[PDB]
Amino acid sequence: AAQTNAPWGLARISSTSPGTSTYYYDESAGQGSCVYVIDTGIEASHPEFEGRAQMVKTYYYSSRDGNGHGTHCAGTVGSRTYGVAKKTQLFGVKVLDDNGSGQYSTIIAGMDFVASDKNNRNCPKGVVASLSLGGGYSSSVNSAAARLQSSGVMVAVAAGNNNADARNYSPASEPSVCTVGASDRYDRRSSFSNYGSVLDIFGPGTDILSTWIGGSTRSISGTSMATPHVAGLAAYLMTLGKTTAASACRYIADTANKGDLSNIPFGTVNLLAYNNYQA
Numbered sequence: 111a112a113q114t115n116a117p118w119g120l121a122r123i124s125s126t127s128p129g130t131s132t133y134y135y136d137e138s139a140g141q142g143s144c145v146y147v148i149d150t151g152i153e154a155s156h157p158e159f160e161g162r163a164q165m166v167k168t169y170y171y172s173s174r175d176g177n178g179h180g181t182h183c184a185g186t187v188g189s190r191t192y193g194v195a196k197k198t199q200l201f202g203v204k205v206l207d208d209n210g211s212g213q214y215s216t217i218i219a220g221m222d223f224v225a226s227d228k229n230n231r232n233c234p235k236g237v238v239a240s241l242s243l244g245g246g247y248s249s250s251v252n253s254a255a256a257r258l259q260s261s262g263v264m265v266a267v268a269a270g271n272n273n274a275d276a277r278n279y280s281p282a283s284e285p286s287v288c289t290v291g292a293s294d295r296y297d298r299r300s301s302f303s304n305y306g307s308v309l310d311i312f313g314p315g316t317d318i319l320s321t322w323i324g325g326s327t328r329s330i331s332g333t334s335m336a337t338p339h340v341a342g343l344a345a346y347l348m349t350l351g352k353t354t355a356a357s358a359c360r361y362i363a364d365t366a367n368k369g370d371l372s373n374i375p376f377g378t379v380n381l382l383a384y385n386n387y388q389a
């Protein structure tokens with residue numbers, strides 16, 4: 111399948127070269143997979159989600175996304191126009207309030223929730239969790255991310271936005287999950303992207319168009335935007351049978367475009383997520 115005039119990040123993850131605008135992907139499109147977006151919520155009523163999104167848990171007085179961040183990330187995973195995996199099922203877990211903030215205890219609870227709740231959902235092709243959040247190092251937060259991964263969920267986490275080594279941030283620094291840095295449309299590391307040996311992969315993160323609250327759309331930047339590209343890619347590849355939740359991060363690294371990014375610090379992987387799709 112081909113989507114013309116796609117957001118640059120979708121085109122990039124289906125290309126061996128920057129500078130193209132069509133997204134190419136197998137029409138299975140992540141059908142039969144599920145992606146949990148652990149964030150500020152998801153505006154599931156957005157036309158872009160086509161009934162495939164639903165809120166399943168909140169830790170606040172409402173499950174509504176009053177911020178937009180979670181809706182944007184969910185759109186990059188799985189919205190019809192802006193998403194990698196256009197037929198996946200999206201599940202929202204609101205661990206961040208409408209200011210984008212959340213206590214580590216709440217974030218940990220949300221991760222343990224997903225590890226259990228996937229047993230209440232029909233996801234025959236596999237389960238992914240996208241975590242576009244983090245803060246300073248916490249062994250408890252890292253342990254929760256490791257538990258979620260060990261339970262059979264492909265965990266993709268944002269590296270962070272401080273132009274610093276991600277070893278000092280959580281859950282970015284947990285080795286067993288998939289830690290995602292950000293790139294721009296000219297194949298440069300995004301100016302704010304964290305780096306380091308803990309990174310597994312880069313995805314598009316600068317100027318990413320996706321869904322927003324109020325039935326709208328906008329372009330924003332962050333490792334938060336790169337992470338759902340990788341989460342959606344994992345769901346897509348799992349539906350194709352090419353990998354599993356336990357192996358998808360390694361598979362994405364194995365099949366990535368290699369050596370194409372600039373301003374990658376020595377010791378950080380030079381790997382850009384790529385779907386290897388051939389019509």
Ligand SMILES: C[C@H]1CC[C@H](NC(=O)Cn2ccnc2)CC1
Binds near residue numbers: 128130295296
């Ligand atoms: C909107 C732009 C359209 C053109 C794109 N071409 C490239 O990236 C290729 N390139 C890089 C340096 N010199 C040539 C990039 C985005």
Ligand SMILES: C[C@H]1CC[C@H](NC(=O)Cn2ccnc2)CC1
Binds near residue numbers: 179
């Ligand atoms: C409202 C949004 C919620 C998530 C926000 N923060 C991060 O991702 C920060 N981070 C990642 C790793 N270490 C720190 C970005 C804004």
